[PDB]
Symmetry: C3
């Protein structure tokens, strides 16, 4: 069991870790659109989707892996009208074989975020 | 690592796989009430719930397993006033030992779906 | 594979088990704020958060583990204004290394619960 932590990803203040590695499996925390250096949400849905992917990418790298190792991705959106935009931006972060995934429209997200995503990595 | 694809489940169009098998653990994508041949949602809640289970069943069979191997299932409903019905129909697809599960009321689901479910299977 | 059942956790009514242990990994069902003895929800947000943690703890103990073995926790709240209180109460139930977690605002929860949480445990 390993705590995965990178200062390239937003600081984890509170009782949780950016990710926990257990055996070959890395359980990554939900990432919201926080700019790590300012700890404020970036403005705009495309920038927020992109920031969540950058944050998850930073954690995956700290775990000695990459998006190629992601087996499952959960997508949480306050507005599913933006789901096609998530699909589009993913083309810039993923390629075959793609992760399994779930996507739901939620009522609200921490800090007023429009998008949050978590994932499971298998090294 | 292995990509799981059932030609009986709805086609995965876009950046995801129906399921990803990593060792003995199969991470299955969320399934919505899509009729695989028409790629349109079936009508009415009972039909939708049933279609989701049928879709997950196809993916489970493609993974070389069955509902008996599912260890966790997530239920996403736009209206929990439909929970009695998900429970009833679920009882008809699973038997002891029953899987672990979570259930939440969401604001919305892809394509205006009334229900979405994902699962984890262990061979 | 093993069914985990704690008689200190709310009875599982329906087609589910409180938790399933497969190998070294335990997949735990979402717990809501039910008082196991009355099957009624405890009242007040702090009590509800505490009861869900107590319910997961009971289930974790029956799986041969504890909160130290939790690698991922999912928090579902109908009102995220209650997130700070979840954080505070959670700090009393966990110690470093802390688990990974996700937290979302949902439209509704079973039985009118204000909070629900599920978790994954990896036993040594
Ligand atoms: O507000 C920051 C929060 O964002 C969530 O996505 C993180 O995963 C939580 O653990 C954290 O408390
Ligand atoms: O609209 C179809 C969508 O439904 C979800 O349940 C699938 O698993 C997603 O990967 C897919 O994009
Ligand atoms: O009302 C109790 C319900 O609470 C959920 O969080 C459990 O995980 C469900 O399986 C159960 O039906």
């Amino acid at each position: 069991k390993t705590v995965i932590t990178s200062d390239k990803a937003p600081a984890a203040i509170g009782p949780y870790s950016q990710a926990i590695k257990a055996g070959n499996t890395v359980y990554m925390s939900g990432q919201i659109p926080l700019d790590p250096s300012t700890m404020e949400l970036v403005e705009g849905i495309e920038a927020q989707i992109t920031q969540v992917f950058e944050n998850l990418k930073s954690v995956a790298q700290a775990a000695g892996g990459s998006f190629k190792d992601i087996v499952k991705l959960n997508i949480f959106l306050t507005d599913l009208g933006h789901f096609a935009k998530v699909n589009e931006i993913m083309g810039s972060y993923f390629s075959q074989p793609y992760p399994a995934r779930a996507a739901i429209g939620v009522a609200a997200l921490p800090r007023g975020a429009q998008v949050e995503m978590d994932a499971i990595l298998v090294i």
